[PDB]
């Protein structure tokens, strides 16, 4: 499952349309969306039966494959391609949004899930904002 992730920043940017200005933790108007940085990768061992015949001789007496004589209850063979997940860094650009007039010294950041709860597996977060001029007043 590839789930989305929401960036929130409720002291610098203004609120997007149809969002209520609140300070409850699990609402926090969203400033951008991404994808969770967990990919997949294939490896092609290509043997998968000799490498299963020999693996349960030097590493595994009978802990898996408890019934090594019944044909239905035997251990399933491994595929000729194997797939393992991996974690990569993510570099993203979210475009422009209008920001407030006066910016306080301390700032909040928040990175949530699709069901509005903080993901505990985030190790590094980092942002850069570069203001420009839009229409006059």
């Amino acid at each position: 499952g590839a789930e989305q992730v929401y960036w929130s920043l409720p002291d610098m940017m203004q609120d997007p349309v149809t969002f209520r200005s609140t300070r409850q933790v699990n609402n926090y108007p969203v400033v951008g969306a991404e994808l969770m940085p967990v990919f997949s990768k294939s490896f092609y061992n290509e043997q998968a039966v000799y490498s299963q015949q020999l693996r349960q001789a030097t590493s595994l007496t009978h802990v898996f494959n408890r019934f090594p004589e019944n044909q239905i209850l035997i251990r399933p063979p491994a595929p000729t391609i194997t797939t393992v997940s991996e974690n990569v860094p993510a570099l993203t650009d979210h475009g422009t949004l209008p920001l407030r007039s006066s910016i306080r010294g301390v700032q909040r950041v928040t990175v949530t899930d699709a069901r509005r709860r903080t993901c505990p597996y985030v190790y590094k977060a980092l942002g850069i904002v570069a203001p420009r001029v839009l229409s006059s007043r």
Partner: protein
Amino acid sequence: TEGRNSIRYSELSPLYDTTKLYLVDNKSADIASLNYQNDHSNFLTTVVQNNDFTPTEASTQTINFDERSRWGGQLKTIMHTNMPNVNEYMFS
């Protein structure tokens, strides 16, 4: 450029000349109410993020952008699929 670039929802504050609009499908309210017969390729979703309104009664508000100006906004998509090699759908 000033004056004619407001974005009124109906009752909140008016924005000015940049917002974002999220077309997600993982809302927990649309699963029980709107989308019941269809799948991820032909779904039906909401734009208002207000949660004072069930999506049957949120199909009435209009996010009317300002007139006397031509609008238009760019599009970014993210799709993710998983089809087998040999299957019946693509005559293989």
